[PDB]
Amino acid sequence: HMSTPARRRLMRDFKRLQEDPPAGVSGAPSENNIMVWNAVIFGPEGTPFEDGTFKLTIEFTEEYPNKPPTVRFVSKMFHPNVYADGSICLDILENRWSPTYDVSSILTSIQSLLDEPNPNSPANSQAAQLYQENKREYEKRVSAIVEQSWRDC
């Protein structure tokens, strides 16, 4: 709601996302908790993640937007910078956070991450190994989770 600066800022992020969502992204606060959002990122076109519809949750603190939220993929993911539990290694969530970034820019940065993995953070050792040694097999694995992202188990 509107009780703290972080909550009003989150409402403004929500407004931006409603009326002007970047391509292939969506998100909204949970019904009972403005600090926890559900989001969906569509895989960027021209990439192995194309056609993928990936759910994520985002958890904000009352320090937002000064402190970045923690973002986790809910859908199964196969990507060098994404752990088995869904946690994400993203520069703007760790080292390059700016209070100018909102939910929209966070979702697009992850969308871009899917296209261009950061080789400094091999969170998924097999995904990193295949990405640097076997693009075909890498894309085979990504295709599998793309299809699985259409089903929300």
Side-chain angles (χ1 to χ4, degrees):
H1 51 310
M2 244 60 73
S3 70
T4 75
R7 286 154 192 270
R8 305 188 289 270
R9 161 70 184 257
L10 279 173
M11 286 308 301
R12 292 192 293 273
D13 293 9
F14 187 29
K15 179 182 167 294
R16 304 310 168 282
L17 252 180
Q18 277 186 317
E19 68 196 5
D20 198 9
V25 312
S26 66
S30 63
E31 186 195 40
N32 298 311
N33 193 349
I34 180 84
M35 293 297 112
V36 176
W37 289 37
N38 298 290
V40 181
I41 288 176
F42 292 180
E45 302 174 43
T47 76
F49 296 85
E50 192 174 4
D51 290 357
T53 58
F54 305 108
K55 314 164 80 182
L56 326 82
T57 61
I58 307 170
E59 187 167 36
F60 304 91
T61 171
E62 288 287 356
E63 307 190 82
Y64 187 72
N66 294 295
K67 291 295 178 302
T70 59
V71 187
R72 207 190 62 88
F73 274 108
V74 177
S75 298
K76 270 163 294 163
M77 178 52 57
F78 189 88
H79 183 275
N81 310 129
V82 177
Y83 282 98
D85 70 352
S87 302
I88 304 178
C89 292
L90 185 54
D91 46 6
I92 69 170
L93 300 176
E94 307 264 317
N95 313 327
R96 297 297 98 100
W97 177 249
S98 183
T100 61
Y101 301 153
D102 55 4
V103 181
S104 288
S105 70
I106 287 174
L107 298 180
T108 57
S109 301
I110 299 168
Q111 211 175 236
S112 293
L113 195 58
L114 301 179
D115 184 13
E116 213 171 90
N118 190 336
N120 304 336
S121 303
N124 184 328
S125 49
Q126 189 191 210
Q129 172 188 17
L130 291 190
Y131 176 82
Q132 307 192 293
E133 300 176 354
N134 196 325
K135 166 207 188 67
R136 179 176 187 92
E137 188 64 37
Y138 178 85
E139 296 183 339
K140 205 161 129 184
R141 304 280 221 277
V142 175
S143 288
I145 59 100
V146 162
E147 301 184 14
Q148 285 158 34
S149 80
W150 306 332
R151 146 175 77 87
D152 35 86
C153 266

